[model samples]
Target: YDNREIVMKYIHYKLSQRGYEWDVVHLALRQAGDDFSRRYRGDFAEMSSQLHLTPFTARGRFATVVEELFRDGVNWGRIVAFFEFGGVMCVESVNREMSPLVDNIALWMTEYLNRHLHTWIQDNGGWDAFVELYG
Candidate 1:
């Protein structure tokens, strides 16, 4: 099957796990870049397409995609083009304030990003190298 389809499925599943309250996911994706002009202007049909992941079917691959986005540099366009699949994963864990998993996931997410960022910086030479690569 197609990579986008797989990603979409994973995203859908992840969102559903938290009651599928996807507004925060959209907000995060929109925050990541400016190309999502239709983000606020679009109707549900349009937005749903922008958020569809077919169905969540993969476990390991989905986690890999999430880690890669934080470890490597994030491709905003790919995140958007893929219906904010990666973006949702990144923000979902930290967004649910009232959910029991919120604090736990938030802690894990914080450490995960820090670890990946440090590794990325070290592997690239240093912070300066990271700035150059990302800049």
Candidate 2:
């Protein structure tokens, strides 16, 4: 959640419930001073590959947003609201090509997200609360 204090309070309650055993949900916050970037900044792909939990198929946030819009009575307003705040912010404004490629990629991703989201939700699992734009 956006409210860190609230999150802390919730965690505190959870910890109390479990007799203060902080092995499961505890986060280690080491100081990232001089040797921060190289030492602590591990490749996300490598980290993701190591964790084994669920066998279900996975899709990115963008795909989920697009799927929700097309499949569930979504309009431009909903689609923009669903994605524009976060991942869309991370999307590059400028394209790679010498020509106007930024617009091209953005459009492509938008369309692709819409396409796959609808396909996956209908074909795979139904809509889930896990794939939502809450934060």
Candidate 3:
């Protein structure tokens, strides 16, 4: 039933060499997702898109969506997907350099991590759990 734990142990041993938390965390979530979340970027990247949206406005919209996502409860998979979604959001804005909505990311990732996710994160298996899960 918990073969997942073994997978995590594998991830940790590998990551000790060189790894970043979000990317590993990202892996678990990537697998955790069904069809939809994995494909969510296409929607954002497509006709109804966030790429061209002003970071000033986009940041506000995404935060509310983040709050809505976890209103059900925190799932590592969801957080992982969010980071991916946020990355698409982040990259386009920086690339477009649309009037330098400088550091829109800082306000969300740094702010939201401290404000929102830290609690349920450690409450579960903790970063130690996350480290292993990264495998």
Candidate 4:
């Protein structure tokens, strides 16, 4: 909940500061939907991703990392399975190529998985939601 609040606050701040108008938030989300599909929506690749969501996960820290990757066009199912695969792999920094906005991926990821990770199961609850999207 706290992390989501930060997302909402940041969105409001960015839009309001740039005179994008409050309605722009909805419009931006809509735009994001398009950008997301174009950039990362495709069949799964052979590469494996990392998942560090252990019990000691910090507040919003890892979540932010995941979002950053998503915004950068990273695959959700691959990454989720990567996480579930149970090994820590270090890949390129999602924000290094372009700052957060160039790919607001971290934020995009946080929102995306939260909404879709659930109903993705075929037997009522499994990792397919995270795997099938790109597979």
Q: How many residue pairs clash in each candidate?
A: 4, 2, 2, 6
Least well predicted 10-residue stretch by lDDT in candidate 3: 14-23
**Candidate 3 structure, TM-score to reference:** 0.61
Candidate 4's C-alpha runs over 4 A off are 1-91, 94-103, 121-123, 126-135
lDDT (tens digit, per residue) of candidate 3 on 1-135: 123333333333323323322125545544543343446756655723534467457876676678777888897777665555554554455456552442455345656766677787778876568657656
**Whole-model lDDT per candidate:** 0.41, 0.33, 0.53, 0.35
Which scores greater on lDDT, model 2 or model 4? 4
The candidate that wins on TM-score is 3
If scored against the real structure, what TM-score would every candidate get?
0.31, 0.25, 0.61, 0.23
Itemize residue pairs with steric clashes in candidate 1. 8-53, 9-53, 9-55, 9-56
Q: Which stretches of candidate 1 lie over 4 Å from their true place?
A: 1-30, 33-62, 68-98, 121-135
Error of 2 at 135 (Å): 4.8
Residue 101 in candidate 4, Cα distance off native in Å: 5.0
Model 2 scores a C-alpha lDDT of: 0.33
Query: Against the true structure, candidate 4 has what lDDT?
Result: 0.35
Tens-place lDDT per residue, model 1, 47-85, is 334432322422343555566545546443444433444
The positional error of residue 77 in candidate 2, measured at the CA in angstroms, is 24
Candidate 4 residue lDDT tens string, 8-86: 4444544444444322333333244334434644422222223232223322434554455556444444443323211
**Tens digit per residue, CA lDDT, model 2, 46-94:** 5334422121212343345446556766443443333332222122221
What candidate 3 gets wrong by more than 4 Å, as runs, is 1-41, 47-51
Candidate 3 lDDT at 65 equals 70
Would you list the clashing residue pairs of candidate 4? 67-105, 67-106, 68-105, 68-106, 71-105, 77-130
